[PDB]
Write a protein that binds this ligand. Structure first.
Ligand SMILES: *CCCCO[C@@H]1O[C@H](CO)[C@@H](O[C@@H]2O[C@H](CO)[C@@H](O)[C@H](O)[C@H]2O)[C@H](O)[C@H]1O
Ligand SMILES: [Ca+2]
Length: 214
């Protein structure tokens, strides 16, 4: 059925790949407008997503999304999140009503508030609440480390620097989704994220992405 294996080095933009979110806010708990102009590719070949103030307590943030959808297989990122309260840095897979399907996502989240920790979650058809905070013995934000999840029909495995950190066993997502990375600040969730203190510009770097199909 879907999208085949690729390897993204982030030195050449080309069509039918990836698209940026621009000029709209996801609302609720994302307290920033997505700006296409906050997705910058560097000359050494790393996507650089940023969080910036447009106006005083008015912030803009950054999202990148694959045009195609991807299934079952191995997902790999080399990435450096932003450390700072009240923010998230992620790489996930997503589909939603938004796309005309059941909301299916698996994810890796770096809560800027603690980047010596990662949050593993997934959502099958709206039900999520499967969050696993693992403690990586380093600061994710002092450098580039590889983060994989093996999405399968029976389990989801998660790997930090080739080390198995978490497996998921009950009700695993089964709709193909887009690969999505972003940097956003939140409202309401002071509890989960901490409070964003207004500090900017913040940025998460993504060195490369690889999806290996089965
Ligand atoms: C799982 C926790 C992190 C993000 O959750 C989901 O993020 C999606 C992308 O940021 C978002 O879906 C997008 O919403 C916009 C606004 O309607 C659409 O343009 C896009 O098609 C859709 O994927 C979800 O809102 C959220 O659950
Ligand atoms: Ca690159």
């Amino acid at each position: 059925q879907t999208g085949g294996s690729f390897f993204e080095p982030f030195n050449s933009y080309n069509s039918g790949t990836w698209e940026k979110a621009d000029g709209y806010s996801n609302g609720g708990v994302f307290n920033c407008t997505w700006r296409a102009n906050n997705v910058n590719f560097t000359n050494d070949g790393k996507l650089k997503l940023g969080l910036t103030s447009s106006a005083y307590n008015k912030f803009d943030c950054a999202e990148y999304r694959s045009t195609n959808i991807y299934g079952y297989g191995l997902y790999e990122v080399s990435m450096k999140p932003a450390k700072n309260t009240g923010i998230v840095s992620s790489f996930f897979t997503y589909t939603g009503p938004a796309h005309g399907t059941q909301w299916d996502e698996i994810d890796i989240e770096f809560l800027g508030k603690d980047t010596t920790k990662v949050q593993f979650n997934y959502y099958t058809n709206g039900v999520g609440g499967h969050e696993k905070v693992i403690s990586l013995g380093f600061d994710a934000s002092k450098g580039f480390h590889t983060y994989a999840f093996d999405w399968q029909p029976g389990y989801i495995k998660w790997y930090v620097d080739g080390v198995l950190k978490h497996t998921a066993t009950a009700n695993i997502p089964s709709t193909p989704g887009k690969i999505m990375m972003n940097l956003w600040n939140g409202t309401g969730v002071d509890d989960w994220l901490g409070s964003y203190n207004g500090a900017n510009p913040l940025y998460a770097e993504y060195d490369w992405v690889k999806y290996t199909s089965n």
